[PDB]
């Protein structure tokens, strides 16, 4: 009702927004996007509360994503209207007149609710309460205050807080209330929830940010930090406070980096522009700390080292598929380094020689499915690879590709072997890729499969992605490469060489008393467990205790040492025997092993969420005796299928193997009774397991299964009889 004051609110808001702008220079040129202010803090915006009739330009609702079909565009919320207009506080804040009426209901309604609950003789519980958690002038939730029993003596408290202004040199706006007695008295969850919808939803906001560049799977599990940057106690205890003019800007580093595809716009900083001398990145105006942050990210010629990597790794496909296409040979031009950010024109990167002559389809997108019309054109085909660093205005990659293709081929600024070629385009700021140009049979789905592989596999992109992530200090909970899970298990028996690796019994330790009675701990011998599922081949490198001499204690380097042994093996093992995939039981081993195996990039490394019962197998006396009596490190080999594969299917033999070890884990000697039901049962002495017929194996398999399920029931405190055969199989295989 106080129209004079609403005008002041609009004034004050515009002033503070200008203060942010000057922190990014900008000065008089307008069209600065509103999204950076009002986006909630959890998405990395400033979280500004709005009290004016500001509106978003209709250009800012655009968003896009790439999938296997190619790119798809979206245009959030609008049917025709410009009416997206950044909610006022006032609609979401309840009038006093309603508060003073509602408090006569809820404090009476609660009183009835507990009275019947105590007549029900049970504790009032959160599901009864969430409908009226946040109501009443004394808020209902104040009854659950930590120290409520002692606050009942704090009389006079409103007088005291008003008088605090004569003692504390700060000033606080909540001089009339305190959360200890009144509760929170406002809530703006609803405000935040539809601020996002006003700006175009979560997927619409993130186009204005570098989020796509970091290549996280999804925006759910993300977390920020602000406790270990430069802003430590170092920053504040440092002498000479007048130094805070350069390093006064540096807390803003993260914010400027995060929002950079919309601060750096040509459409906003109208004026002269520059290109950062080792990159393709154009800059408009002098943003105070973006130039610093980019040079760090692309340190040590990363642009070329992305480019020439992708060139070689693409050629590696053509280095194998020689007979899949009408080509004789391919060549790598190894042309001068600076072309990777020579935007004015490009030469070809790769050259291909026909057997005779293909058909040339037509100049068309990578997504264009079909048809042919162009003349056959003998011998000469070429591809170019274009990197770029896009932003919000021009992150469309397919329009970019077709544009650059025409520009260079129509005039003499470029040399290519022939008109028959294509250029790939990759936007490193959003991880989009596409191509435009000429094609030939088979090549188009081949390039599709190749690029789809490259964008996740390539080491040089991994360097770039990790630097952006660590520079943003943005962390995630769930994302990894795909876990080994139950439904994958059939792929383990494919013709590829595959190893399991387990290290759980390396750094074992024994407590003992000293002769002085004080307690301490001794390390003992360990082993590295390595096993082949589709062949039964096992390796066992005994780690003798002496290797940790001097080190001892917490055994910190044990995981790193473990990777060294595995790498030493694989290096000396013949090339044809090398794994295609290594699967590791403990996720902590992944980073050590990866670093040591970079010389052999054919090796897939994969972590399991599905645990396996190998840990108990090393307590079998046939193995335990050997490890204890050993006095120097030495390798040992076993085949855990004694003779089974001569009649038994490998996955069924694997099933038997898993059953035995799991049973020994859960009930030990009782499983041995099933292994040894009469003392007159027999084995070869070389064998791990008794000599038995297939029927006799089937009999004990059922018995071991029934023990495992019974023990599963006992420790889950639940009936076993509801389980299906598939659920039984999953529990045996490792986890449901």
């Amino acid at each position: 009702n106080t129209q004079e004051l609403l005008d002041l609110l609009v004034k004050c808001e515009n002033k503070i927004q200008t203060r942010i702008k000057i922190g990014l220079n900008s000065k008089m040129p307008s069209r600065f996007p509103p999204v950076v202010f009002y986006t909630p803090k959890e998405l990395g915006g400033l979280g500004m509360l709005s009290m004016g009739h500001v509106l978003i330009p209709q250009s800012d609702l655009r968003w896009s994503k790439q999938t296997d079909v190619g790119i798809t565009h979206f245009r959030s919320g609008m049917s025709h209207e410009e009416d997206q207009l950044i909610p006022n506080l006032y609609r979401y804040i309840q009038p006093w007149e309603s508060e003073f009426i509602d408090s006569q209901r809820v404090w009476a309604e609660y009183a009835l609710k507990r009275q019947e609950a105590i007549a029900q003789n049970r504790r009032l519980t959160l599901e009864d309460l969430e409908d009226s958690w946040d109501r009443g002038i004394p808020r209902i939730n104040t009854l659950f205050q930590k120290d409520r029993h002692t606050l009942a003596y704090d009389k006079g408290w409103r007088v005291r807080t008003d008088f605090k202004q004569y003692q504390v040199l700060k000033q606080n706006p909540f001089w009339w209330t305190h959360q200890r007695h009144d509760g929170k008295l406002w809530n703006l969850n609803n405000y935040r929830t539809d601020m996002i919808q006003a700006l175009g939803g979560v997927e619409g906001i993130l186009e204005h940010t570098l989020f796509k560049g970091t290549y996280f799977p999804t925006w759910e599990g993300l977390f920020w930090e602000k406790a270990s940057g430069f802003e430590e106690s170092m920053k504040w205890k440092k002498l000479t406070n007048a130094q805070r003019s350069g390093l006064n800007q540096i807390p803003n580093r993260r914010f400027t980096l995060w929002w950079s595809p919309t601060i750096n716009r040509a459409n906003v900083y109208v004026g002269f522009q520059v290109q950062l001398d080792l990159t393709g990145i154009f800059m408009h105006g002098k943003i105070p700390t973006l130039k610093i942050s980019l040079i760090q990210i692309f340190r040590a010629h990363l642009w070329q080292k992305i480019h020439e990597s992708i060139v070689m790794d693409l050629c590696q496909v053509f280095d194998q598929e020689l007979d899949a296409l009408e080509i004789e040979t391919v060549q790598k031009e190894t042309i001068h380094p600076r072309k990777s950010y020579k935007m004015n024109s490009s030469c070809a990167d790769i050259l291909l020689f026909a057997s005779y002559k293909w058909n040339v389809s037509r100049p068309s997108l990578l997504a264009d499915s079909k048809d042919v019309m162009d003349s056959t054109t003998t011998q000469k085909y070429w591809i170019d690879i274009q990197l770029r660093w896009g932003d919000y205005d021009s992150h469309d990659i397919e329009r970019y590709a077709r544009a650059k293709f025409l520009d260079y081929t129509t005039d003499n600024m470029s040399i290519y072997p022939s008109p028959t070629g294509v250029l790939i385009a990759i936007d490193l700021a959003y991880n989009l890729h596409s191509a435009y140009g000429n094609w030939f049979p088979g090549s188009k789905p081949l390039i599709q499969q190749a690029m789809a592989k490259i964008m996740k596999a390539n080491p040089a992109l991994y360097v770039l992605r990790e630097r952006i992530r660590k520079g943003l200090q943005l962390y995630s909970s769930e994302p990894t490469e795909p876990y080994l899970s139950s439904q994958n298990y059939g792929e383990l028996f494919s013709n590829q060489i595959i190893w399991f690796v387990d290290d759980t019994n390396v750094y074992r330790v024994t407590i003992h008393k000293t002769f002085e009675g004080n307690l301490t701990t001794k390390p003992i011998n360990g082993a590295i467990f390595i096993f082949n599922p589709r062949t039964g081949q096992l390796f066992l490198k005994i780690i003798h205790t002496s290797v940790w001499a001097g080190q001892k204690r917490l055994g910190q380097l044990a995981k790193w040492k473990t990777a060294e042994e595995v790498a030493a093996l694989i290096r000396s093992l013949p090339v044809e025997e090398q794994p295609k995939q290594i699967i590791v039981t403990r996720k902590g081993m992944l980073d050590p092993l990866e670093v040591h195996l970079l010389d052999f990039p054919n090796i897939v490394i994969k972590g399991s969420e599905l645990q396996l019962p190998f840990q108990a197998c090393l307590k079998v006396e046939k193995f335990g005796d050997l490890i204890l009596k050993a006095t120097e490190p030495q390798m040992v080999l076993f085949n855990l299928y004694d003779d089974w594969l001569k009649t038994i299917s490998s996955y069924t033999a694997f099933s038997r193997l898993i059953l035995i070890l799991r049973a020994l884990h859960v009930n030990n000697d009782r499983a041995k009774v099933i292994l040894k039901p009469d003392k007159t049962t027999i084995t070869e002495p070389h064998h791990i397991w008794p000599t038995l017929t297939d029927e006799e194996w089937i009999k004990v398999e059922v018995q071991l299964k029934d023990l495992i399920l019974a023990d599963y029931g006992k420790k889950n405190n639940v009936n076993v009889a509801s389980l299906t055969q598939s659920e039984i199989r999953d529990i045996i295989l490792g986890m449901e």
Binding site: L569, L573, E632, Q634
Partner: peptide, 20 residues
């Protein structure tokens, strides 16, 4: 590095893994 094949009915000793 010493290896001790115990995969079955014979025991063999390699002294480097390239012999395997």
């Amino acid at each position: 590095v010493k290896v001790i094949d115990m995969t079955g009915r014979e025991q063999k000793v390699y002294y480097s893994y390239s012999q395997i």
